[PDB]
Scaffold this active site. Sequence first.
Site, mmCIF file in Angstrom:
data_model
loop_
_atom_site.group_PDB
_atom_site.id
_atom_site.type_symbol
_atom_site.label_atom_id
_atom_site.label_comp_id
_atom_site.label_asym_id
_atom_site.label_seq_id
_atom_site.Cartn_x
_atom_site.Cartn_y
_atom_site.Cartn_z
ATOM 1 N N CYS A 30 34.234 -4.695 -84.215
ATOM 2 C CA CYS A 30 34.074 -5.047 -85.686
ATOM 3 C C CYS A 30 32.457 -5.416 -85.949
ATOM 4 N N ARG A 36 47.033 -17.957 -67.130
ATOM 5 C CA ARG A 36 47.250 -19.480 -67.623
ATOM 6 C C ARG A 36 48.430 -19.813 -67.383
ATOM 7 N N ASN A 89 44.954 -8.515 -80.830
ATOM 8 C CA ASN A 89 44.994 -9.743 -80.206
ATOM 9 C C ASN A 89 46.382 -10.502 -80.159
ATOM 10 N N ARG A 137 52.590 -15.051 -113.597
ATOM 11 C CA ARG A 137 53.130 -15.129 -114.930
ATOM 12 C C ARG A 137 53.108 -14.053 -115.850
ATOM 13 N N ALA A 192 40.731 -6.076 -76.534
ATOM 14 C CA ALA A 192 41.301 -7.166 -77.272
ATOM 15 C C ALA A 192 42.869 -7.310 -76.689
ATOM 16 N N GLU A 202 39.722 -0.602 -66.865
ATOM 17 C CA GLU A 202 38.878 -0.358 -68.032
ATOM 18 C C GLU A 202 38.228 0.778 -67.617
ATOM 19 N N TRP A 231 44.515 -22.412 -112.895
ATOM 20 C CA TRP A 231 45.322 -21.341 -112.450
ATOM 21 C C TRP A 231 44.833 -20.408 -111.924
ATOM 22 N N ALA A 246 33.125 -6.911 -79.145
ATOM 23 C CA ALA A 246 33.701 -6.959 -80.740
ATOM 24 C C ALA A 246 33.337 -5.702 -81.288
HETATM 25 C C1 LIG Z 1 33.590 0.273 -86.286
HETATM 26 C C2 LIG Z 1 34.514 -0.806 -86.040
HETATM 27 C C3 LIG Z 1 34.741 -1.895 -86.971
HETATM 28 C C4 LIG Z 1 36.147 -2.553 -86.807
HETATM 29 N N1 LIG Z 1 36.113 -3.638 -87.957
HETATM 30 C C5 LIG Z 1 37.264 -4.399 -87.570
HETATM 31 C C6 LIG Z 1 37.491 -5.633 -88.370
HETATM 32 O O1 LIG Z 1 36.565 -5.897 -89.212
HETATM 33 N N2 LIG Z 1 38.625 -6.190 -88.314
HETATM 34 C C7 LIG Z 1 39.549 -6.004 -87.545
HETATM 35 O O2 LIG Z 1 40.594 -6.624 -87.605
HETATM 36 N N3 LIG Z 1 39.201 -4.809 -86.678
HETATM 37 C C8 LIG Z 1 38.299 -4.049 -86.853
HETATM 38 N N4 LIG Z 1 38.148 -2.968 -85.917
HETATM 39 C C9 LIG Z 1 39.345 -2.894 -84.926
HETATM 40 C C10 LIG Z 1 39.286 -3.331 -83.907
HETATM 41 O O3 LIG Z 1 38.091 -3.495 -83.229
HETATM 42 C C11 LIG Z 1 40.557 -2.856 -82.940
HETATM 43 O O4 LIG Z 1 41.501 -2.623 -83.706
HETATM 44 C C12 LIG Z 1 40.766 -3.531 -81.447
HETATM 45 O O5 LIG Z 1 39.716 -3.475 -80.788
HETATM 46 C C13 LIG Z 1 42.053 -2.865 -80.879
HETATM 47 O O6 LIG Z 1 42.132 -3.533 -79.471
HETATM 48 P P1 LIG Z 1 42.671 -2.853 -78.284
HETATM 49 O O7 LIG Z 1 42.728 -3.573 -77.039
HETATM 50 O O8 LIG Z 1 44.105 -2.325 -78.775
HETATM 51 O O9 LIG Z 1 41.926 -1.463 -78.296
HETATM 52 P P2 LIG Z 1 40.311 -1.193 -77.610
HETATM 53 O O10 LIG Z 1 39.604 -2.460 -78.018
HETATM 54 O O11 LIG Z 1 40.032 0.119 -78.368
HETATM 55 O O12 LIG Z 1 40.686 -1.052 -76.280
HETATM 56 C C14 LIG Z 1 41.097 -0.108 -75.412
HETATM 57 C C15 LIG Z 1 40.256 -0.123 -74.184
HETATM 58 O O13 LIG Z 1 41.239 0.601 -73.208
HETATM 59 C C16 LIG Z 1 40.088 1.684 -72.360
HETATM 60 N N5 LIG Z 1 40.927 2.753 -72.174
HETATM 61 C C17 LIG Z 1 41.305 4.035 -72.972
HETATM 62 N N6 LIG Z 1 42.040 4.743 -72.126
HETATM 63 C C18 LIG Z 1 41.975 4.191 -70.828
HETATM 64 C C19 LIG Z 1 42.400 4.829 -69.360
HETATM 65 N N7 LIG Z 1 43.065 6.001 -69.517
HETATM 66 N N8 LIG Z 1 42.175 4.069 -68.394
HETATM 67 C C20 LIG Z 1 41.569 2.849 -68.532
HETATM 68 N N9 LIG Z 1 41.246 2.278 -69.743
HETATM 69 C C21 LIG Z 1 41.368 3.239 -70.913
HETATM 70 C C22 LIG Z 1 39.107 1.895 -73.559
HETATM 71 O O14 LIG Z 1 37.614 2.062 -73.025
HETATM 72 C C23 LIG Z 1 38.903 0.429 -74.311
HETATM 73 O O15 LIG Z 1 38.036 -0.566 -73.794
HETATM 74 C C24 LIG Z 1 36.859 -2.199 -85.978
HETATM 75 C C25 LIG Z 1 36.909 -1.057 -85.270
HETATM 76 C C26 LIG Z 1 35.580 -0.244 -85.374
HETATM 77 C C27 LIG Z 1 35.588 0.871 -84.307
HETATM 78 C C1 LIG Z 2 38.271 -13.123 -75.306
HETATM 79 C C2 LIG Z 2 39.711 -13.094 -75.112
HETATM 80 C C3 LIG Z 2 39.810 -12.726 -73.721
HETATM 81 C C4 LIG Z 2 40.242 -14.353 -75.798
HETATM 82 O O1 LIG Z 2 41.501 -14.506 -74.951
HETATM 83 P P1 LIG Z 2 42.442 -16.057 -75.632
HETATM 84 O O2 LIG Z 2 43.558 -16.346 -74.719
HETATM 85 O O3 LIG Z 2 42.484 -15.604 -77.097
HETATM 86 O O4 LIG Z 2 41.452 -17.251 -75.779
HETATM 87 P P2 LIG Z 2 41.063 -18.290 -74.404
HETATM 88 O O5 LIG Z 2 41.233 -17.381 -73.233
HETATM 89 O O6 LIG Z 2 39.837 -18.995 -74.837
HETATM 90 O O7 LIG Z 2 42.224 -19.157 -74.676
HETATM 91 C C5 LIG Z 2 42.818 -19.790 -75.799
HETATM 92 C C6 LIG Z 2 43.864 -20.677 -75.266
HETATM 93 O O8 LIG Z 2 43.302 -21.932 -74.777
HETATM 94 C C7 LIG Z 2 43.671 -22.891 -75.611
HETATM 95 N N1 LIG Z 2 42.471 -23.913 -75.933
HETATM 96 C C8 LIG Z 2 41.271 -23.376 -76.022
HETATM 97 N N2 LIG Z 2 40.358 -24.561 -76.151
HETATM 98 C C9 LIG Z 2 41.151 -25.495 -75.949
HETATM 99 C C10 LIG Z 2 41.000 -26.957 -76.121
HETATM 100 N N3 LIG Z 2 39.636 -27.385 -76.394
HETATM 101 N N4 LIG Z 2 41.684 -27.884 -75.815
HETATM 102 C C11 LIG Z 2 43.363 -27.313 -75.767
HETATM 103 N N5 LIG Z 2 43.307 -25.950 -75.738
HETATM 104 C C12 LIG Z 2 42.355 -25.088 -75.833
HETATM 105 C C13 LIG Z 2 44.163 -22.449 -76.950
HETATM 106 O O9 LIG Z 2 45.156 -23.314 -77.330
HETATM 107 C C14 LIG Z 2 44.857 -21.113 -76.581
HETATM 108 O O10 LIG Z 2 46.198 -21.412 -75.870
HETATM 109 P P3 LIG Z 2 47.355 -20.044 -75.868
HETATM 110 O O11 LIG Z 2 46.603 -19.096 -75.265
HETATM 111 O O12 LIG Z 2 48.292 -20.756 -74.988
HETATM 112 O O13 LIG Z 2 47.612 -19.790 -77.395
HETATM 113 C C15 LIG Z 2 40.112 -11.939 -76.206
HETATM 114 O O14 LIG Z 2 40.377 -12.233 -77.534
HETATM 115 C C16 LIG Z 2 39.597 -10.543 -75.990
HETATM 116 O O15 LIG Z 2 39.458 -9.924 -74.846
HETATM 117 N N6 LIG Z 2 38.987 -10.041 -77.020
HETATM 118 C C17 LIG Z 2 38.243 -8.926 -77.313
HETATM 119 C C18 LIG Z 2 37.329 -9.029 -78.466
HETATM 120 C C19 LIG Z 2 37.988 -9.026 -79.642
HETATM 121 O O16 LIG Z 2 38.841 -9.795 -80.152
HETATM 122 N N7 LIG Z 2 37.948 -7.841 -80.339
HETATM 123 C C20 LIG Z 2 38.762 -7.289 -81.621
HETATM 124 C C21 LIG Z 2 37.659 -7.631 -82.519
HETATM 125 S S1 LIG Z 2 38.136 -6.871 -83.937
#
Ligand SMILES: Cc1cc2nc3c(=O)[nH]c(=O)nc-3n(C[C@H](O)[C@H](O)[C@H](O)COP(=O)(O)OP(=O)(O)OC[C@H]3O[C@@H](n4cnc5c(N)ncnc54)[C@H](O)[C@@H]3O)c2cc1C
Ligand SMILES: CC(C)(COP(=O)(O)OP(=O)(O)OC[C@H]1O[C@@H](n2cnc3c(N)ncnc32)[C@H](O)[C@@H]1OP(=O)(O)O)[C@@H](O)C(=O)NCCC(=O)NCCS
Lengths: 444, 444
Positions: free
Chosen positions: B42, B21, B304, B441, B10, B32, B433, B40
């Site tokens: 989540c 971009r 994010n 209130r 994320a 990674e 309300w 996801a």
């Molecule tokens: C079961 C579950 C449910 C969740 N539900 C929600 C929810 O409903 N809403 C919400 O907001 N959040 C939720 N979360 C939390 C959310 O998914 C995390 O906060 C988010 O993924 C964090 O993003 P990140 O990129 O900081 O960490 P991560 O997504 O954990 O990414 C870290 C990455 O770094 C890699 N890494 C670690 N060490 C090294 C290394 N030494 N070298 C290379 N790579 C490494 C790992 O493999 C991992 O892919 C949930 C989490 C879990 C586990």
């Molecule tokens: C998927 C991931 C790479 C998305 O990256 P992102 O930059 O947020 O999204 P995108 O790459 O689609 O790009 C979005 C951008 O394009 C623009 N855009 C998208 N569609 C557009 C459209 N139709 N017209 C104009 N602009 C558009 C947006 O304005 C946005 O701009 P900004 O980055 O300047 O604010 C990232 O969220 C990720 O790796 N996530 C892991 C999954 C996750 O979220 N896990 C946690 C869950 S708890």
Amino acid sequence: MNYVIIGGDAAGMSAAMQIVRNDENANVVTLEKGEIYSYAQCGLPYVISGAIASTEKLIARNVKTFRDKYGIDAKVRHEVTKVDTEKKIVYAEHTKTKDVFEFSYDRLLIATGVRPVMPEWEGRDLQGVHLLKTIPDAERILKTLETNKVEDVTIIGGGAIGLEMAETFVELGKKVRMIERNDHIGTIYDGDMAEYIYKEADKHHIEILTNENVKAFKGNERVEAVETDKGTYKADLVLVSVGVKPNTDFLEGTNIRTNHKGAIEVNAYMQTNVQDVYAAGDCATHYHVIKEIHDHIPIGTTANKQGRLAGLNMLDKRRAFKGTLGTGIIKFMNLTLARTGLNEKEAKGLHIPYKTVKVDSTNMAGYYPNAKPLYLKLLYRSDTKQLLGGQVIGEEGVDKRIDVIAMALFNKMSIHDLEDVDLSYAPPYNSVWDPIQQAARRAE
Amino acid sequence: MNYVIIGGDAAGMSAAMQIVRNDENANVVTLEKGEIYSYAQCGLPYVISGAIASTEKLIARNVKTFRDKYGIDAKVRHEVTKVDTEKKIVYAEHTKTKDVFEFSYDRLLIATGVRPVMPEWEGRDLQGVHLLKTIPDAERILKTLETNKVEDVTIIGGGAIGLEMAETFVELGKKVRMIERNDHIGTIYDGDMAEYIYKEADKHHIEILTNENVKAFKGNERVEAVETDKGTYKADLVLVSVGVKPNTDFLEGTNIRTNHKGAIEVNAYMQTNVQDVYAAGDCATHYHVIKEIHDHIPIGTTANKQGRLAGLNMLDKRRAFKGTLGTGIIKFMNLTLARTGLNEKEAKGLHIPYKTVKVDSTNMAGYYPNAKPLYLKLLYRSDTKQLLGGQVIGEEGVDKRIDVIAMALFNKMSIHDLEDVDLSYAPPYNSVWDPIQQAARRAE
Ligand SMILES: Cc1cc2nc3c(=O)[nH]c(=O)nc-3n(C[C@H](O)[C@H](O)[C@H](O)COP(=O)(O)OP(=O)(O)OC[C@H]3O[C@@H](n4cnc5c(N)ncnc54)[C@H](O)[C@@H]3O)c2cc1C
Ligand SMILES: CC(C)(COP(=O)(O)OP(=O)(O)OC[C@H]1O[C@@H](n2cnc3c(N)ncnc32)[C@H](O)[C@@H]1OP(=O)(O)O)[C@@H](O)C(=O)NCCC(=O)NCCS
Ligand SMILES: Cc1cc2nc3c(=O)[nH]c(=O)nc-3n(C[C@H](O)[C@H](O)[C@H](O)COP(=O)(O)OP(=O)(O)OC[C@H]3O[C@@H](n4cnc5c(N)ncnc54)[C@H](O)[C@@H]3O)c2cc1C
Ligand SMILES: CC(C)(COP(=O)(O)OP(=O)(O)OC[C@H]1O[C@@H](n2cnc3c(N)ncnc32)[C@H](O)[C@@H]1OP(=O)(O)O)[C@@H](O)C(=O)NCCC(=O)NCCS
Ligand SMILES: NC(=O)C1=CN([C@@H]2O[C@H](COP(=O)(O)OP(=O)(O)OC[C@H]3O[C@@H](n4cnc5c(N)ncnc54)[C@H](OP(=O)(O)O)[C@@H]3O)[C@@H](O)[C@H]2O)C=CC1
Ligand SMILES: NC(=O)C1=CN([C@@H]2O[C@H](COP(=O)(O)OP(=O)(O)OC[C@H]3O[C@@H](n4cnc5c(N)ncnc54)[C@H](OP(=O)(O)O)[C@@H]3O)[C@@H](O)[C@H]2O)C=CC1
């Protein structure tokens, strides 16, 4: 000590409760033209559909409660015919006996609301032709459905009541027609958002007639057909739903300033230009947070807020009304329709330079079961990026988004500030970026 | 030109997308440890329940897209073991071949998240004892459910994962027990709100063991029992969900400052104390809007937001992170559990003088069918009335209320200012309300 309030519903009784709670010595007279105090007009369409058992369920507080528990001299069937602001006397005519009663005040609140408009069409007074405002109004609609054989229903006007009653009549299994003199139904919505409303109505076989003008109602003792400039259509029941007018005609002769539609002008403190006379609710003007001007957007939330404030200010517990955002939300079949702030017509009319962003999104995580489409549009100032308005349409999660937009408008947030707010996310409720935030990111 | 990012989820990939971009000349290398980018976490509990078809449905953007479409040199199975911040070299180990690769950087982002904690209990390595973080973790849980006769499930830890997985296991028709060392499950909630959590779990026949300390897992090859200080209980599957630790151990020897728990300290611009080294997401600290200090609240929304901001700041597109509110939302059986800002323990630990208001209310008009209870609590400063925090619990309309509260906290609104906001009302969505406004209130 002598408080007089004209109107015994949302604004009037909200004010009454403030006065009664914050002054033990006060003499509160409330004058209500009808027989029913404190009732929910909002629930009427849902009584008529059968979703709510009866209109009795819509009474928030009995007149007997007001009298016995709060010591308010609550009068029913007292129609105010004139006010003498120099002598400080209110003249009320009893609606049945026609007797005239005088009520002297130290402070006066006008909270008479609005009444539905019936244009001067031939057939106006035919049995089965209905307006919707009051509990007796809804009972008369139910009376028509009970006694008549109703198959075809025609609704004139595609605004708030038209939309909700179109649903009510469809749920009652009727063939429903809507007639609007404008380009589309859901007139407050921008052209692009209104297409979703039309689609939903078409989906449920509601016939929409647009740019069409009602001429007359034809029939015997009762309404049988609606005549327009484009044809004559069978209607067993006609609901006229074409707008409202402030109940302020009885103030002709006073120096009390009104806007062009007859809404009573009020300052921040619910005061008119006439000393010791206040107004609140649908009969008063409503300062608009975004327009920075007094508008007229009659709605129940604003009525309660203004009523409470009028009461407070009448006690000299000084507190300003912060304004309306023009927030509105409607249930329309399987859709929720919501709006707040400015639409494009409003922004244009104000000569505010603005841009728009529209997102076709989902209400929650795209991968989660039964995630539903969500259509969201934002308006923002092209110079400062100040958020100006929003429109949200969808099956679920629409009220959440419009409430968040309303909060942003209230705090005069820039569209990009939305990106920084720690809104909630779990898969069943949202996406990791809320649709509002994804729209904000698209903005310039 | 040379950007290196550690962690491919994320925070890391949000950063990568910004750089790619906003700089066509950039060489972006992402490292990674695992085999899966951008997924996801989540959705993991809902894959295990079977609500979502498979873990493949949770991938947001696969590695091929990052490589081919965006020109990111996205590496898989590359574990970073060392960073030399003086020479500006990242050393990574291939997780299969164990061969060592080095990567030169101009700017570095650490986005390694957190890992689940496994306490050093006897029998922790037994088959059927599980942590939940990654897609493979979820597949291992599905492996146990498939290959083994699972009827009794024990969950250790009554926080976010424990609560969501209790639902998952009940839905799979298991006899579920959860064990907490604290006074109640849902520890972030105040005692009085936590009662609603206990009631819902009890209703669905979840055994809750409180103030109980796990000492060992018993069994030969697989788990068959969980031993505690108060007893030994049969378990065919054990989920350990007792918290998380930042993945920052490999940084020992770098001068990069971390807090007590090992989270990397960042300033407004996601910069560490070491030149050209950045951090974002769960491995980093999170400035708290209300506490006004750096906290650690690892969550996907914040990851994010910080990821995106780190990318922008690494490009010298200077933009401050505004902070977290500690917002969290959980689906728990029939209940939705939401919180934001300070709870009572946080306010107390900070010595901020505060008061509370609690309202037992409905999600919508009381007279409307299927109106459901809504329990809402607010914290606010005794002196200035600044809103500090909220907790909302109910079957419906909880996400809306917590988002409104979050918006209020973000804008540092006084609790009474909530009374003035033009929030939406129609009977199917709210009361005239809103419960937040009724709570407001009641405040002093
Ligand atoms: C079961 C579950 C449910 C969740 N539900 C929600 C929810 O409903 N809403 C919400 O907001 N959040 C939720 N979360 C939390 C959310 O998914 C995390 O906060 C988010 O993924 C964090 O993003 P990140 O990129 O900081 O960490 P991560 O997504 O954990 O990414 C870290 C990455 O770094 C890699 N890494 C670690 N060490 C090294 C290394 N030494 N070298 C290379 N790579 C490494 C790992 O493999 C991992 O892919 C949930 C989490 C879990 C586990
Ligand atoms: C998927 C991931 C790479 C998305 O990256 P992102 O930059 O947020 O999204 P995108 O790459 O689609 O790009 C979005 C951008 O394009 C623009 N855009 C998208 N569609 C557009 C459209 N139709 N017209 C104009 N602009 C558009 C947006 O304005 C946005 O701009 P900004 O980055 O300047 O604010 C990232 O969220 C990720 O790796 N996530 C892991 C999954 C996750 O979220 N896990 C946690 C869950 S708890
Ligand atoms: C069908 C319908 C659905 C609605 N749905 C919603 C909704 O979902 N959400 C929402 O926010 N709002 C809704 N509203 C609007 C909301 O009900 C009104 O805005 C609110 O009732 C206004 O309160 P008020 O006290 O200003 O006026 P009213 O409630 O109209 O009260 C005015 C009172 O003054 C009395 N009066 C008038 N003239 C005199 C006189 N000369 N002497 C003595 N008494 C007089 C009238 O009898 C009336 O009882 C709906 C309205 C209708 C008709
Ligand atoms: C029903 C009506 C009289 C309610 O008046 P109200 O003053 O808003 O509500 P109440 O009389 O219950 O009093 C609320 C006050 O008591 C307090 N209170 C209520 N319950 C409390 C409790 N359990 N503990 C402590 N305080 C409480 C509140 O803090 C509030 O205080 P405030 O007025 O100083 O802010 C008024 O809203 C009305 O006439 N409505 C018509 C129906 C309607 O709303 N129609 C429009 C629908 S679209
Ligand atoms: N959920 C909610 O917020 C609800 C609110 N209400 C309240 O009731 C009030 C009044 O509702 P309503 O009566 O629907 O008024 P509205 O203004 O909402 O809608 C009336 C519509 O009828 C049109 N119209 C006017 N004259 C004609 C005509 N001769 N032939 C065909 N169409 C015509 C109007 O267009 P034009 O602009 O040209 O006049 C307008 O589009 C609202 O302001 C609101 O306070 C009622 C129900 C639900
Ligand atoms: N919807 C959402 O917001 C979700 C978010 N997540 C994410 O996952 C992260 C980690 O979740 P989770 O693993 O549940 O961590 P949590 O901190 O949320 O919960 C762990 C719980 O286990 C307790 N605990 C610690 N040690 C023991 C022990 N020996 N025996 C019994 N209980 C113990 C902790 O108490 P104590 O405080 O004393 O240590 C705490 O109450 C969260 O921070 C969040 O980022 C996960 C699922 C859903």
